[PDB]
Amino acid sequence: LHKEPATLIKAIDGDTDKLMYKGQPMTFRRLLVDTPEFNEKYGPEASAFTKKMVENAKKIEVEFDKGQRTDKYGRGLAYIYADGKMVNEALVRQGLAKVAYVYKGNNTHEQLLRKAEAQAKKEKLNIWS
């Protein structure tokens, strides 16, 4: 897979951010994760976590997988990196997202994330507390 440049337009929520990619504004949905809704336990904390990561980053990158690059809502599907740290993975590792929406072809980093979730669960972090 390849990291590509993007700039933060606006942090949205635990699952999504508005990013400028190839000079066009786009909502990006993070591959392989599901964060709680704002009304759900740890929903606000998940959005807060990603907001800080993306806002504080000097460099945002997007990494498409081998399959669909846009979902049925027109959202980009990618791994999102903030100063080379993957936000997707970071969420799961902190117990603020579950691994989810694993479709064949778009699952390059599935095992990495599952390992993170196992650790979060063992440490009883957040949604696993």
Ligand SMILES: Cc1cn([C@H]2C[C@H](OP(=O)(O)O)[C@@H](COP(=O)(O)O)O2)c(=O)[nH]c1=O
């Ligand atoms: C994460 C992801 C979601 N989606 C679709 C499935 C879901 O359809 P439905 O809206 O019909 O439930 C929705 C979940 O995204 P959200 O968790 O952001 O709602 O986005 C994909 O098609 N591919 C993906 O990789």
Ligand SMILES: [Ca+2]
């Ligand atoms: Ca969600």
